[PDB]
C-alpha cells in the first residue's frame, strides 16, 4: 500500500503493476495536474451502468474548469482510476472501458452530463446500438469483487487535429457497467460505492483568455 501525492492532493492506493495503457501510447506533448476525485456512485442490485464524458467532467471543477472556459484551444491525456469498496461477502463484476467519440442515440443534458455523470437506460446496446459483448475491443479493465477492487487506464490524446475546443467536443467516454449484478445476503450493506479519480497528464492550452 503506497501513498501517491501530486500537487496538494493525496490518495492512498496499493502499488499494482497491472495498469493498462490505451493502445500502448503514453500521453506526451505536441498546476492543473492533480487528483480530482468525483462524487461517489452507489452500486445497487438493480443498477444498470454509468458513463462520464471527457473533458466535460472537468469543465466546472477547479483550475482545470476555469482554464477551459477562458482559453480557446485544449489538448491533454488522462489517467482514470476507478476503485470499489466492498467486503468479502459481496459479489459482482464491473467492466470499465473507455470509448473514443462515444455518440449516444435517442430511442443536451444527457449528452453532456457534467461532473455527476448519467446512467444507462439500455446497457445491452450501450445506448448507441452497439453490443456490450464487444466492448472489450476498447481499452478496458475488469473489476471483479472476488479478486481486485481497482482499475486504472492511461488514455492519450486521440483526435484528427492536434488542438481542439474543450467546450463542445467530447473526446471519449468512460463506461462502468455491471455485467454480473451485485448480490449479497440480507443484513449486509445494501449499496456498494464506486469512486472515480481523474488526473490530467500533459495538458496544454494555446488560446488566449
Amino acid at each position: 500500500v503506497a501513498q501517491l501525492t501530486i500537487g496538494n492532493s493525496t490518495i492512498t492506493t496499493q502499488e499494482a503493476a497491472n495498469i493498462v495503457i490505451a493502445y500502448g501510447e503514453w500521453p506526451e506533448y505536441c498546476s492543473v495536474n492533480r487528483f480530482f476525485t468525483l462524487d461517489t456512485k452507489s452500486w445497487a442490485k438493480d443498477s444498470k451502468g454509468w458513463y462520464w464524458k471527457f473533458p466535460d467532467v472537468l469543465t466546472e471543477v477547479g483550475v482545470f474548469g476555469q482554464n477551459a472556459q477562458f482559453h480557446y484551444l485544449y489538448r491533454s491525456g488522462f489517467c482514470v482510476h476507478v476503485q470499489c469498496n466492498a467486503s468479502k461477502f459481496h459479489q459482482g463484476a464491473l467492466l470499465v472501458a473507455v470509448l473514443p467519440e462515444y455518440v449516444l442515440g435517442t430511442i443536451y443534458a444527457t449528452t453532456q452530463p457534467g461532473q455527476v455523470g448519467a446512467v444507462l437506460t439500455h446497457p445491452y446496446v450501450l445506448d448507441a446500438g452497439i453490443p456490450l459483448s464487444q466492448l472489450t475491443v476498447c481499452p478496458h479493465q475488469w473489476i471483479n469483487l472476488r479478486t481486485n477492487n481497482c482499475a486504472t487506464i492511461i488514455v492519450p490524446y486521440m483526435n484528427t487535429v492536434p488542438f481542439d475546443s474543450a467546450l463542445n467536443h467530447c473526446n471519449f467516454g468512460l463506461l462502468v457497467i455491471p455485467v454480473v449484478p451485485l448480490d449479497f445476503n440480507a443484513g449486509a450493506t445494501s449499496e456498494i460505492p464506486i469512486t472515480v479519480t481523474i488526473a490530467p497528464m500533459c495538458a496544454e492550452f494555446a488560446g488566449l483568455r
Binding site: 473514443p100 455518440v103 437506460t121 439500455h122 464487444q134 466492448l135 484528427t160 467536443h169
Partner: protein, 212 residues
C-alpha cells in the same frame, strides 16, 4: 448442412485481411435517373447503403482517396449517340440551381464530357478533408467530399431517358481506433438512432443451455 469431411491443414496468407484488401473492390453507391428538370445533383455519401456503412463504422477514423466510374445507358440497355457532362463541385463551391445556371460554365468546377457510346468515365478524387482523417462519429455540435452534377449538353431538352449508376473504389486506405459492429437496424443516415421499443438479441436462441 454440417459435414464432417474436408479439413484443411495449411495456413493461408495474411494479406487477405489487410486493411487495403478489406475495401479494395468497387461497389455501386447510387443509381441516378433522369427521365424525359434536366439535371441531377448527387452529393457524395458513403453511408447511403446499409452495406459499407456497417463496414466503415468498424473504425473511428478513415483516410482514403476515391475513384468513381459512371456506367450510363438507357432505362433498358440501349445506347444512343448522346453527349453528357459530369461536373464535380468541390466542398465550399455553389451547386447549379437549374439547367442553364452560370455554375455549369464555372472554370473551377472540373467537368467530364463523354458520349453514351463510349466506355464509362473514370475520375479519381483525392482526400478532401481539412482535418487529417474522415470521422463517422463526432460527439460535439457543429465529412463533405463534394457533389456530382449530371446533365445533357445542349440548349434544348433531349428526347432520351438517361439512367446511370455510379461505382466507387476506395484507394490508399488507413484506419484507426476499432469499434464494435452495429447489431441494430439503422433508422436515419446521420445519427446512430435505434428503435428502443424492441431490441434484437445479438445471437439466435436455443431451448436449453445443455442442448447443443
Amino acid at each position: 448442412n454440417l459435414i464432417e469431411t474436408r479439413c484443411v491443414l495449411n495456413h493461408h496468407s495474411t494479406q487477405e485481411t489487410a486493411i487495403g484488401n478489406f475495401f479494395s473492390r468497387a461497389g455501386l453507391v447510387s443509381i441516378i435517373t433522369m427521365p424525359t428538370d434536366g439535371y441531377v445533383n448527387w452529393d457524395i455519401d458513403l453511408m447511403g447503403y446499409a452495406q459499407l456503412r456497417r463496414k466503415c463504422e468498424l473504425f473511428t477514423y478513415m483516410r482514403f482517396d476515391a475513384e468513381f466510374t459512371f456506367v450510363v445507358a438507357k432505362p433498358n440497355g440501349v445506347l444512343v449517340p448522346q453527349l453528357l457532362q459530369y461536373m464535380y463541385v468541390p466542398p465550399g463551391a455553389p451547386k447549379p440551381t437549374s439547367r442553364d445556371s452560370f455554375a455549369w460554365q464555372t472554370a473551377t468546377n472540373p467537368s467530364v464530357f463523354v458520349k453514351m457510346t463510349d466506355p464509362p468515365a473514370q475520375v479519381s478524387v483525392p482526400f478532401m478533408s481539412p482535418a487529417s482523417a474522415y470521422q463517422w462519429f463526432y460527439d460535439g455540435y457543429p465529412n463533405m467530399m463534394g457533389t456530382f452534377s449530371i446533365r445533357t449538353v445542349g440548349t434544348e431538352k433531349s428526347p432520351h431517358s438517361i439512367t446511370l449508376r455510379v461505382y466507387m473504389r476506395i484507394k490508399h486506405v488507413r484506419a484507426w481506433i476499432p469499434r464494435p459492429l452495429r447489431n441494430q437496424p439503422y433508422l436515419f443516415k446521420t445519427n446512430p438512432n435505434y428503435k428502443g421499443n424492441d431490441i434484437k438479441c445479438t445471437s439466435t436462441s436455443r431451448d436449453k443451455i445443455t442442448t447443443l
